[PDB]
Structure formats: structure tokens, C-alpha cells
Amino acid sequence: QPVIQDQFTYDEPYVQGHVFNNERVLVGATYGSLAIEAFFNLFPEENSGRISKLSYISPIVIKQGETIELQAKPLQVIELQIMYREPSSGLWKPAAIGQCGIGSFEPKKVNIENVKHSLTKLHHIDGPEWGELFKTITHLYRDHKSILAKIRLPNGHHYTVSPLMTNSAYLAILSFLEQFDMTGGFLPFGINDIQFTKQTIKGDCWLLITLVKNTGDMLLFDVDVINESSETVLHYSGYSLK
């Protein structure tokens, strides 16, 4: 079969919508979504799986007039290499590396109203400059160790697990960190584990995000995505910011 692949062009809203240090930099959220596609391509007849040890190697900058190709190539654990074609040289270069594996998805029950009651609702929900595509968050409730976000998920990027889901988790994390005196930014570094299914999560859902590790100037979070019926539909663990 053809390899899993996508292409991103300078002028499209997904690329226009994330600017960092004056460049259009492909959002790191892209990579976990490509890794999940590569899993389902390798294991049709699995309804759920895992990504492990997903690490972001190199940011991808897209310059005016450019179109960057990405491919997600599996390798013998199953290692995934997400490569991009550097328009300079025409060489493939690694953007991200991880692993994927079979694994069941066992949903967890979460009373959102319960969780909400103990947190403080935030108002005025408005480095990186964000385009409107990525502005998915409708509500936030926060305390010193967690944040609970309600999000709304909505051009020919078709993914089973939207990069907008993973990116919403990053934006909620930044909102969590806003409470602290950390002058200077962060940047997503990778995700230790993702547990996912083939059932596409669309529409309204909640992210419950907990700070689990702070050492080595790395901050790692667990993230549970919950539907409007009190059960979890996607798990991230060790979502890492530098």
C-alpha cells in the first residue's frame, strides 16, 4: 500500500495559524496524528492501539511558496519515523520518532461536574501566534495542579485523531501554566504514551489535564479526553513541555 503521507503548504490556514520566532512552524500536534494513522495502516482489524515514546526531533519551518511533504514510515518493537522532505536539499529528514503497539483501550469514568466543582472557572478565555482554526477552547477550570477544558472540534487533512485534539491539550496546558511566574515560553517535546481507538472523536468534549512531573526543566502532564457522557475516549500520558 502507499505509505501514510500528507503535505502542508505555506498559505493554508493550518500553517498560517501557527507562528513562532517569526516563522510558520508546523505544529508539533501533527506528529502524533500521523503516528496513529501509521498504526491503523499497519493494523487494520485493530480498533484501538498505543503510541509510545513519541519524541519531536526537529521543528519544520515552511517558507513562502513552499510545500512540505511528510511521510510516516514504520520500521523493525515497531518504530515509527515521521520524515519530512527538506525543500532545500530534497532530502528526507526526521521530524519525529516513536513506537506503536497493539493495546486495548479501557475507558475510565469521569464525573465532569464533580471535577468542575473543585476548580476555579476562568474568564476571558482569549510566544506562539495562533490562527482561528486552533482556537478550540470554550471553557477552562483550573487549580494549582490541574486544568479542565471544554473544547469544540470542527482542508483535506483527514485524521482519525485530529491534530486539533492534541494541540488543544497544549493550549490548555499553557492556560494552566499562566498562573505561575514563569517568564519565558515553553515548547512541546513529545508524548510518552497515547492510548486511542478508531472511533473518531468529534464535537464537544473535555480535557482533564494533570501535572505529574516537574524536573530537569521538563514539565510532564497526563491528559484524559472525556465525552459528553462521562467516559474517557483517548488518553495521553507524559505529555512533555520544555
Coordinates of N, CA and C in Angstrom, one line a residue:
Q1 N 0.9 -1.2 0.0 CA 0.0 0.0 0.0 C 0.9 1.2 0.0
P2 N 0.3 2.4 -0.4 CA 1.1 3.6 -0.3 C 1.4 3.9 1.1
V3 N 2.5 4.5 1.4 CA 2.8 5.0 2.7 C 1.8 6.1 3.2
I4 N 1.6 6.1 4.5 CA 0.9 7.3 5.1 C 1.7 8.6 4.9
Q5 N 1.0 9.6 4.4 CA 1.7 10.8 3.9 C 0.7 11.9 3.9
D6 N 1.3 13.1 4.1 CA 0.4 14.4 4.0 C 1.4 15.5 3.5
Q7 N 0.8 16.6 3.1 CA 1.6 17.7 2.6 C 1.0 19.0 3.2
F8 N 1.9 20.0 3.5 CA 1.4 21.2 4.1 C 2.0 22.4 3.3
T9 N 1.2 23.3 3.0 CA 1.6 24.5 2.1 C 1.6 25.8 2.9
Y10 N 2.5 26.7 2.5 CA 2.7 28.0 3.3 C 1.4 28.6 3.6
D11 N 0.5 28.7 2.6 CA -0.6 29.6 2.6 C -1.9 29.0 3.3
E12 N -1.9 27.7 3.6 CA -3.2 27.2 4.1 C -3.4 27.5 5.6
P13 N -4.6 27.5 6.1 CA -4.9 28.0 7.4 C -4.2 27.2 8.6
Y14 N -4.0 25.9 8.4 CA -3.3 25.1 9.3 C -1.8 25.6 9.6
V15 N -1.2 26.2 8.5 CA 0.2 26.6 8.6 C 0.3 28.1 8.9
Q16 N -0.6 28.9 8.3 CA -0.7 30.3 8.7 C -1.0 30.5 10.2
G17 N -1.8 29.5 10.7 CA -2.2 29.6 12.1 C -1.3 29.3 13.2
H18 N 0.0 29.0 13.0 CA 1.0 28.9 14.0 C 2.3 29.5 13.6
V19 N 2.6 30.6 14.3 CA 3.8 31.4 14.0 C 4.7 31.4 15.3
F20 N 6.0 31.1 15.1 CA 6.9 31.0 16.2 C 8.3 31.5 15.9
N21 N 8.8 32.4 16.7 CA 10.1 33.1 16.4 C 10.0 33.6 14.9
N22 N 8.9 34.3 14.5 CA 8.8 34.9 13.2 C 8.7 33.9 12.0
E23 N 8.5 32.6 12.2 CA 8.4 31.7 11.1 C 7.1 30.9 11.2
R24 N 6.6 30.4 10.1 CA 5.5 29.4 10.1 C 6.0 28.0 10.4
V25 N 5.8 27.5 11.6 CA 6.4 26.3 12.1 C 5.3 25.2 12.2
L26 N 5.4 24.1 11.6 CA 4.3 23.1 11.6 C 4.0 22.7 13.1
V27 N 2.8 22.7 13.5 CA 2.5 22.5 14.9 C 2.9 21.0 15.3
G28 N 3.5 20.9 16.4 CA 4.0 19.6 16.9 C 2.9 18.5 17.0
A29 N 1.7 19.0 17.3 CA 0.5 18.1 17.3 C 0.3 17.3 16.0
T30 N 0.8 17.7 14.9 CA 0.7 17.0 13.7 C 1.3 15.5 13.8
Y31 N 2.4 15.4 14.6 CA 3.1 14.2 14.5 C 2.4 13.0 15.2
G32 N 1.8 13.2 16.3 CA 1.0 12.1 17.0 C -0.1 11.6 16.1
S33 N -0.8 12.6 15.4 CA -1.8 12.2 14.5 C -1.3 11.3 13.3
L34 N -0.2 11.7 12.7 CA 0.4 10.9 11.6 C 0.9 9.5 12.2
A35 N 1.4 9.5 13.4 CA 1.8 8.2 14.0 C 0.6 7.2 14.2
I36 N -0.6 7.8 14.6 CA -1.8 7.0 14.8 C -2.3 6.5 13.4
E37 N -2.3 7.3 12.4 CA -2.6 6.8 11.1 C -1.7 5.6 10.6
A38 N -0.4 5.7 10.9 CA 0.6 4.7 10.5 C 0.2 3.4 11.3
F39 N -0.1 3.5 12.5 CA -0.6 2.3 13.2 C -1.8 1.6 12.6
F40 N -2.9 2.4 12.3 CA -4.1 1.8 11.7 C -3.9 1.3 10.3
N41 N -2.9 1.8 9.6 CA -2.5 1.3 8.3 C -1.8 0.0 8.4
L42 N -1.0 -0.2 9.4 CA -0.3 -1.4 9.7 C -1.2 -2.5 10.3
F43 N -2.2 -2.1 11.2 CA -3.1 -3.0 11.8 C -4.5 -2.6 11.5
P44 N -4.9 -2.8 10.2 CA -6.4 -2.8 10.1 C -6.8 -4.0 10.8
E45 N -8.1 -4.0 11.3 CA -8.5 -5.1 12.2 C -8.0 -5.0 13.6
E46 N -7.5 -3.8 13.9 CA -7.4 -3.3 15.3 C -8.3 -2.1 15.5
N47 N -9.1 -2.0 16.6 CA -10.0 -0.9 16.8 C -9.4 0.1 17.8
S48 N -8.2 -0.3 18.3 CA -7.5 0.5 19.3 C -6.0 0.2 19.3
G49 N -5.2 1.1 19.8 CA -3.8 0.9 19.8 C -3.1 1.8 20.8
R50 N -1.7 1.8 20.7 CA -0.9 2.7 21.5 C 0.2 3.3 20.7
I51 N 0.5 4.6 20.9 CA 1.8 5.1 20.5 C 2.7 5.2 21.8
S52 N 4.0 5.0 21.7 CA 4.9 5.1 22.8 C 6.1 5.9 22.4
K53 N 6.6 6.7 23.4 CA 7.9 7.3 23.3 C 8.1 8.2 22.1
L54 N 7.0 9.0 21.8 CA 7.0 9.9 20.7 C 7.8 11.1 21.1
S55 N 8.8 11.4 20.3 CA 9.8 12.4 20.5 C 9.9 13.3 19.3
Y56 N 9.9 14.7 19.5 CA 9.9 15.6 18.4 C 11.4 16.0 18.2
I57 N 11.8 15.7 17.0 CA 13.3 15.8 16.7 C 13.7 17.2 16.2
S58 N 12.9 17.7 15.3 CA 13.3 19.0 14.6 C 12.0 19.7 14.2
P59 N 12.0 21.0 14.5 CA 10.8 21.8 14.0 C 10.8 21.9 12.5
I60 N 9.6 21.9 11.9 CA 9.6 22.1 10.5 C 9.1 23.5 10.2
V61 N 10.0 24.3 9.5 CA 9.6 25.7 9.1 C 9.2 25.7 7.6
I62 N 8.1 26.3 7.3 CA 7.6 26.4 6.0 C 7.7 27.8 5.5
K63 N 8.5 28.0 4.4 CA 8.7 29.3 3.9 C 7.8 29.6 2.8
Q64 N 7.7 30.9 2.5 CA 6.8 31.4 1.4 C 7.0 30.6 0.1
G65 N 5.9 30.2 -0.5 CA 5.9 29.4 -1.7 C 6.2 27.9 -1.6
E66 N 6.6 27.4 -0.4 CA 6.9 26.0 -0.2 C 5.8 25.1 0.2
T67 N 5.9 23.8 -0.2 CA 5.0 22.8 0.2 C 5.9 21.7 0.8
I68 N 5.7 21.3 2.0 CA 6.5 20.2 2.7 C 5.7 18.9 2.7
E69 N 6.4 17.8 2.3 CA 5.8 16.5 2.3 C 6.2 15.9 3.6
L70 N 5.3 15.2 4.3 CA 5.6 14.3 5.4 C 5.2 12.9 5.1
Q71 N 6.0 11.9 5.6 CA 5.6 10.5 5.5 C 5.8 9.9 6.9
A72 N 5.1 8.8 7.2 CA 5.2 8.1 8.5 C 5.6 6.7 8.1
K73 N 6.8 6.4 8.3 CA 7.4 5.1 7.8 C 7.7 4.2 9.0
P74 N 7.2 2.9 8.9 CA 7.3 2.0 10.0 C 8.6 1.2 9.8
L75 N 9.1 0.6 10.9 CA 10.4 0.0 10.9 C 10.6 -1.0 12.0
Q76 N 11.4 -2.0 11.7 CA 11.6 -3.1 12.7 C 12.9 -2.8 13.6
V77 N 9.9 -4.3 18.9 CA 9.0 -3.2 18.7 C 9.0 -2.6 17.3
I78 N 7.8 -2.1 16.9 CA 7.6 -1.3 15.7 C 8.0 0.2 15.9
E79 N 9.0 0.7 15.3 CA 9.4 2.1 15.4 C 8.8 2.9 14.2
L80 N 8.2 4.0 14.5 CA 7.7 4.9 13.5 C 8.7 6.1 13.3
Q81 N 9.0 6.3 12.0 CA 9.8 7.5 11.7 C 8.9 8.5 10.9
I82 N 8.7 9.7 11.4 CA 8.0 10.7 10.7 C 9.0 11.6 10.1
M83 N 9.1 11.6 8.7 CA 10.1 12.3 8.0 C 9.5 13.4 7.2
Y84 N 10.2 14.4 6.9 CA 9.8 15.5 6.0 C 10.8 15.7 5.0
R85 N 10.4 16.3 3.8 CA 11.3 16.4 2.7 C 11.7 17.9 2.7
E86 N 12.9 18.1 3.1 CA 13.5 19.5 3.2 C 13.6 20.1 1.8
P87 N 12.8 21.1 1.6 CA 12.8 21.6 0.2 C 14.2 22.1 -0.3
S88 N 15.0 22.6 0.6 CA 16.4 22.9 0.3 C 17.1 21.9 -0.5
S89 N 17.1 20.6 0.0 CA 18.0 19.6 -0.5 C 17.2 18.5 -1.2
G90 N 15.9 18.5 -0.9 CA 15.1 17.3 -1.4 C 15.4 16.1 -0.6
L91 N 16.0 16.2 0.5 CA 16.3 15.0 1.3 C 15.2 14.9 2.4
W92 N 14.8 13.6 2.6 CA 14.1 13.3 3.9 C 14.9 13.4 5.1
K93 N 14.3 14.0 6.1 CA 14.9 14.3 7.4 C 13.9 13.9 8.5
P94 N 14.3 13.4 9.6 CA 13.4 13.1 10.7 C 12.8 14.3 11.4
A95 N 11.4 14.3 11.5 CA 10.7 15.3 12.3 C 10.4 14.7 13.6
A96 N 10.0 13.5 13.7 CA 9.6 12.8 15.0 C 9.9 11.3 14.9
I97 N 10.0 10.7 16.1 CA 10.2 9.3 16.2 C 9.4 8.8 17.3
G98 N 8.8 7.6 17.1 CA 8.1 6.9 18.2 C 8.0 5.4 18.0
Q99 N 7.0 4.8 18.7 CA 6.7 3.4 18.6 C 5.3 3.2 18.6
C100 N 4.8 2.1 17.9 CA 3.4 1.8 18.1 C 3.2 0.3 18.4
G101 N 2.0 0.0 19.0 CA 1.8 -1.3 19.5 C 0.3 -1.6 19.6
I102 N -0.1 -2.9 19.5 CA -1.4 -3.3 19.9 C -1.7 -3.0 21.4
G103 N -2.9 -2.8 21.7 CA -3.3 -2.5 23.1 C -4.7 -2.1 23.2
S104 N -5.4 -2.6 24.2 CA -6.8 -2.3 24.3 C -7.0 -0.9 24.9
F105 N -8.1 -0.3 24.6 CA -8.5 0.9 25.3 C -9.6 0.7 26.3
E106 N -9.2 0.8 27.6 CA -10.1 0.7 28.7 C -10.6 2.0 29.1
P107 N -11.8 2.5 28.8 CA -12.4 3.7 29.2 C -12.5 3.9 30.8
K108 N -12.4 5.1 31.2 CA -12.5 5.4 32.6 C -13.7 6.3 32.8
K109 N -14.3 6.3 34.0 CA -15.4 7.1 34.2 C -14.9 8.4 34.9
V110 N -15.5 9.5 34.4 CA -15.1 10.8 35.0 C -16.4 11.7 35.1
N111 N -16.7 12.0 36.4 CA -17.8 13.0 36.6 C -17.3 14.4 36.4
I112 N -17.6 15.0 35.3 CA -17.1 16.3 34.9 C -17.6 17.4 35.9
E113 N -18.9 17.3 36.2 CA -19.5 18.2 37.2 C -18.8 18.1 38.5
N114 N -18.4 16.9 38.9 CA -17.7 16.7 40.2 C -16.3 17.4 40.1
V115 N -15.6 17.0 39.1 CA -14.3 17.6 38.9 C -14.3 19.2 38.9
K116 N -15.3 19.7 38.1 CA -15.5 21.1 37.9 C -15.7 21.9 39.2
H117 N -16.6 21.3 40.1 CA -16.9 21.9 41.4 C -15.8 22.3 42.2
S118 N -14.7 21.6 42.2 CA -13.5 21.9 43.0 C -12.5 22.8 42.3
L119 N -12.7 23.2 41.1 CA -11.8 24.1 40.3 C -12.3 25.5 40.2
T120 N -11.5 26.4 39.8 CA -11.9 27.8 39.6 C -12.2 28.0 38.1
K121 N -13.4 28.4 37.8 CA -13.7 28.9 36.4 C -12.9 30.1 36.0
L122 N -12.3 30.1 34.8 CA -11.5 31.2 34.3 C -12.4 31.9 33.3
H123 N -12.1 33.2 33.1 CA -12.9 34.1 32.2 C -11.9 34.7 31.3
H124 N -12.4 35.4 30.3 CA -11.5 36.0 29.2 C -10.7 34.9 28.7
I125 N -11.3 33.8 28.1 CA -10.5 32.7 27.6 C -9.5 33.1 26.5
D126 N -9.7 34.2 25.8 CA -8.6 34.6 24.9 C -7.2 34.8 25.7
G127 N 4.8 32.9 23.5 CA 5.3 33.2 22.1 C 4.4 33.0 21.0
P128 N 3.9 31.7 20.8 CA 3.2 31.3 19.6 C 2.0 32.3 19.2
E129 N 2.0 32.7 18.0 CA 0.8 33.4 17.5 C -0.2 32.4 16.8
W130 N -1.4 32.4 17.2 CA -2.4 31.4 16.8 C -3.4 31.9 15.9
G131 N -3.7 31.2 14.8 CA -4.8 31.4 13.9 C -6.1 30.8 14.5
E132 N -7.3 31.2 13.9 CA -8.6 30.9 14.5 C -8.9 29.4 14.5
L133 N -8.5 28.7 13.4 CA -8.6 27.2 13.4 C -8.3 26.5 14.7
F134 N -7.2 27.0 15.4 CA -6.6 26.3 16.6 C -7.4 26.8 17.9
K135 N -8.2 27.8 17.8 CA -8.9 28.3 19.0 C -10.1 27.5 19.3
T136 N -9.9 26.4 19.9 CA -11.0 25.4 20.1 C -11.6 25.4 21.5
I137 N -10.9 26.2 22.4 CA -11.3 26.0 23.8 C -12.5 27.0 24.1
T138 N -13.5 26.4 24.8 CA -14.7 27.2 25.2 C -14.8 27.5 26.7
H139 N -14.3 26.6 27.5 CA -14.3 26.8 28.9 C -13.1 26.2 29.6
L140 N -12.6 26.9 30.6 CA -11.5 26.4 31.5 C -11.8 26.5 32.9
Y141 N -11.4 25.4 33.7 CA -11.5 25.5 35.1 C -10.2 24.9 35.7
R142 N -9.6 25.6 36.6 CA -8.1 25.4 36.9 C -7.9 25.3 38.4
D143 N -6.9 24.6 38.8 CA -6.3 24.8 40.2 C -4.8 24.5 40.1
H144 N -4.1 24.6 41.2 CA -2.6 24.5 41.2 C -2.0 23.3 40.6
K145 N -2.8 22.2 40.3 CA -2.2 21.0 39.8 C -2.9 20.5 38.6
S146 N -4.0 21.1 38.2 CA -4.8 20.6 37.0 C -5.5 21.6 36.3
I147 N -6.0 21.3 35.1 CA -6.9 22.2 34.4 C -7.9 21.3 33.7
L148 N -9.2 21.8 33.6 CA -10.2 21.0 32.9 C -10.8 22.0 31.8
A149 N -10.7 21.5 30.6 CA -11.0 22.4 29.4 C -12.2 21.7 28.7
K150 N -13.2 22.5 28.3 CA -14.1 22.1 27.3 C -13.7 22.6 26.0
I151 N -13.7 21.7 25.0 CA -13.3 22.2 23.6 C -14.4 21.9 22.6
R152 N -14.3 22.6 21.5 CA -15.1 22.2 20.3 C -14.3 21.9 19.1
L153 N -14.3 20.6 18.7 CA -13.7 20.2 17.5 C -14.6 20.2 16.3
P154 N -14.1 20.7 15.1 CA -14.9 21.1 14.0 C -15.3 19.9 13.1
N155 N -8.1 21.7 5.6 CA -8.7 21.4 4.3 C -8.1 20.2 3.6
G156 N -8.8 19.1 3.6 CA -8.2 17.8 3.3 C -6.9 17.6 4.1
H157 N -7.1 17.7 5.4 CA -6.4 16.8 6.3 C -7.3 16.0 7.1
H158 N -7.4 14.7 6.7 CA -8.4 13.8 7.3 C -7.6 12.9 8.3
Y159 N -7.8 13.0 9.6 CA -7.1 12.2 10.5 C -8.1 11.6 11.5
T160 N -7.9 10.3 11.9 CA -8.7 9.6 12.9 C -8.7 10.4 14.2
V161 N -7.5 10.7 14.6 CA -7.3 11.6 15.8 C -6.8 12.9 15.4
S162 N -7.7 14.0 15.5 CA -7.3 15.3 14.9 C -6.1 15.8 15.6
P163 N -5.2 16.5 14.8 CA -4.1 17.3 15.5 C -4.7 18.4 16.3
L164 N -6.0 18.8 16.0 CA -6.6 19.8 16.8 C -6.8 19.3 18.2
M165 N -7.0 18.0 18.4 CA -7.2 17.5 19.8 C -6.0 17.6 20.6
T166 N -4.9 17.1 20.0 CA -3.6 17.2 20.7 C -3.2 18.6 20.9
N167 N -3.4 19.5 19.9 CA -3.0 20.8 20.1 C -3.8 21.5 21.2
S168 N -5.1 21.2 21.3 CA -6.0 21.8 22.4 C -5.4 21.4 23.7
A169 N -4.8 20.3 23.9 CA -4.2 19.9 25.1 C -3.0 20.8 25.4
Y170 N -2.2 21.1 24.4 CA -1.1 22.1 24.6 C -1.7 23.5 25.0
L171 N -2.7 23.9 24.4 CA -3.2 25.3 24.7 C -3.8 25.3 26.1
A172 N -4.5 24.3 26.5 CA -5.0 24.1 27.9 C -3.8 24.1 28.9
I173 N -2.8 23.4 28.6 CA -1.6 23.4 29.4 C -1.0 24.8 29.6
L174 N -0.9 25.6 28.5 CA -0.4 26.9 28.6 C -1.3 27.8 29.5
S175 N -2.6 27.6 29.5 CA -3.5 28.2 30.4 C -3.3 27.8 31.8
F176 N -3.0 26.6 32.0 CA -2.6 26.1 33.4 C -1.4 26.8 33.9
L177 N -0.4 26.9 33.0 CA 0.9 27.5 33.5 C 0.9 29.0 33.7
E178 N -0.1 29.6 33.1 CA -0.3 31.1 33.1 C -0.4 31.6 34.6
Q179 N -0.8 30.7 35.5 CA -1.0 31.0 36.9 C 0.3 31.3 37.6
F180 N 1.4 30.8 37.0 CA 2.7 30.8 37.6 C 3.5 32.0 37.1
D181 N 4.6 32.3 37.9 CA 5.6 33.3 37.5 C 6.7 32.6 36.7
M182 N 6.4 32.2 35.5 CA 7.4 31.7 34.6 C 7.5 32.6 33.4
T183 N 8.5 33.4 33.4 CA 8.6 34.4 32.4 C 9.5 33.9 31.3
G184 N 8.9 33.6 30.1 CA 9.6 32.8 29.1 C 8.7 31.6 28.8
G185 N 8.9 31.1 27.6 CA 7.8 30.3 27.0 C 8.1 28.8 27.3
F186 N 7.4 28.0 26.6 CA 7.6 26.5 26.7 C 7.6 26.0 25.2
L187 N 7.9 24.7 25.0 CA 7.7 24.1 23.7 C 7.5 22.6 23.9
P188 N 6.4 22.1 23.2 CA 6.2 20.6 23.3 C 7.4 19.8 22.8
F189 N 7.7 18.8 23.5 CA 8.9 18.0 23.3 C 8.6 16.6 22.9
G190 N 7.4 16.1 23.3 CA 6.9 14.8 22.8 C 5.9 14.3 23.8
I191 N 5.5 13.0 23.6 CA 4.4 12.4 24.4 C 4.8 10.9 24.7
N192 N 4.9 10.6 26.0 CA 5.4 9.3 26.4 C 4.4 8.1 26.0
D193 N 3.1 8.3 26.0 CA 2.1 7.3 25.7 C 0.9 7.9 25.2
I194 N 0.3 7.4 24.1 CA -1.1 7.7 23.8 C -1.9 6.4 23.6
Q195 N -3.0 6.4 24.2 CA -3.9 5.2 24.0 C -5.2 5.7 23.3
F196 N -5.5 5.0 22.2 CA -6.5 5.6 21.3 C -7.4 4.4 20.7
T197 N -8.5 4.8 20.2 CA -9.4 4.0 19.3 C -9.7 4.6 17.9
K198 N -10.3 3.8 17.1 CA -10.7 4.1 15.7 C -11.9 5.0 15.7
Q199 N -12.7 5.0 16.8 CA -13.9 5.8 16.8 C -13.6 7.3 16.9
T200 N -13.9 8.1 15.9 CA -13.4 9.4 15.7 C -14.1 10.3 16.7
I201 N -13.4 11.1 17.4 CA -14.0 12.0 18.5 C -14.2 13.3 17.8
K202 N -15.5 13.7 17.7 CA -15.9 15.0 17.1 C -16.8 15.7 18.0
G203 N -16.9 17.0 17.8 CA -17.9 17.8 18.5 C -17.3 18.3 19.8
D204 N -18.2 18.4 20.8 CA -17.8 18.8 22.2 C -17.2 17.7 22.9
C205 N -16.1 18.0 23.6 CA -15.5 17.1 24.6 C -14.7 17.9 25.6
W206 N -14.2 17.2 26.6 CA -13.5 17.8 27.7 C -12.1 17.2 27.8
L207 N -11.1 18.0 28.3 CA -9.8 17.5 28.5 C -9.5 17.7 30.0
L208 N -9.1 16.7 30.7 CA -8.8 16.8 32.1 C -7.3 16.6 32.2
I209 N -6.5 17.6 32.6 CA -5.1 17.6 32.5 C -4.4 17.8 33.8
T210 N -3.5 16.9 34.2 CA -2.9 16.9 35.5 C -1.4 17.0 35.4
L211 N -0.8 17.9 36.1 CA 0.7 18.0 36.2 C 1.2 16.8 37.0
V212 N 2.1 16.0 36.4 CA 2.6 14.8 37.1 C 4.2 14.8 37.4
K213 N 4.9 15.6 36.6 CA 6.4 15.6 36.8 C 6.9 17.0 36.5
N214 N 7.8 17.5 37.3 CA 8.5 18.7 37.1 C 9.9 18.4 37.6
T215 N 10.8 18.2 36.7 CA 12.2 18.0 37.0 C 13.0 18.4 35.7
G216 N 14.2 18.8 35.8 CA 15.1 18.9 34.6 C 14.6 20.0 33.6
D217 N 13.8 21.0 34.2 CA 13.1 22.0 33.3 C 12.2 21.3 32.3
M218 N 11.7 20.1 32.6 CA 10.7 19.5 31.8 C 9.4 19.4 32.6
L219 N 8.3 19.7 32.0 CA 7.0 19.6 32.8 C 6.2 18.6 32.0
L220 N 5.8 17.5 32.7 CA 5.0 16.4 32.0 C 3.6 16.3 32.6
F221 N 2.7 16.1 31.8 CA 1.2 16.1 32.1 C 0.6 14.8 31.7
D222 N -0.4 14.4 32.4 CA -1.4 13.4 31.9 C -2.6 14.1 31.4
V223 N -3.2 13.5 30.3 CA -4.3 14.2 29.7 C -5.4 13.1 29.4
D224 N -6.6 13.3 30.0 CA -7.7 12.4 29.6 C -8.8 13.2 28.8
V225 N -9.1 12.6 27.7 CA -10.2 13.2 26.9 C -11.5 12.5 27.2
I226 N -12.5 13.3 27.5 CA -13.8 12.7 28.0 C -14.9 13.2 27.2
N227 N -15.9 12.3 26.9 CA -17.0 12.6 26.1 C -18.1 13.3 26.9
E228 N -19.3 13.6 26.3 CA -20.3 14.3 27.0 C -21.2 13.3 27.8
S229 N -20.7 12.1 27.9 CA -21.4 11.0 28.7 C -20.4 10.5 29.7
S230 N -19.5 11.3 30.2 CA -18.7 10.9 31.4 C -17.7 9.8 31.3
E231 N -17.3 9.4 30.1 CA -16.3 8.4 29.9 C -15.2 8.9 29.0
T232 N -14.0 8.3 29.3 CA -12.8 8.7 28.5 C -12.7 8.0 27.2
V233 N -12.2 8.7 26.2 CA -12.2 8.2 24.8 C -10.8 8.3 24.2
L234 N -9.8 8.9 24.9 CA -8.4 9.0 24.4 C -7.6 9.4 25.7
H235 N -6.5 8.7 25.8 CA -5.5 9.0 27.0 C -4.2 9.4 26.4
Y236 N -3.6 10.5 27.0 CA -2.2 10.8 26.8 C -1.5 10.7 28.2
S237 N -0.3 10.2 28.2 CA 0.5 10.2 29.4 C 1.9 10.7 29.2
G238 N 2.4 11.5 30.1 CA 3.7 12.1 29.9 C 3.8 13.0 28.6
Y239 N 2.8 13.8 28.5 CA 2.8 14.9 27.5 C 3.8 16.0 28.0
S240 N 4.9 16.2 27.2 CA 6.1 16.9 27.7 C 6.2 18.2 27.1
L241 N 6.5 19.2 28.0 CA 6.9 20.6 27.6 C 8.3 20.9 28.2
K242 N 9.1 21.5 27.4 CA 10.4 22.0 27.9 C 10.2 23.5 28.3

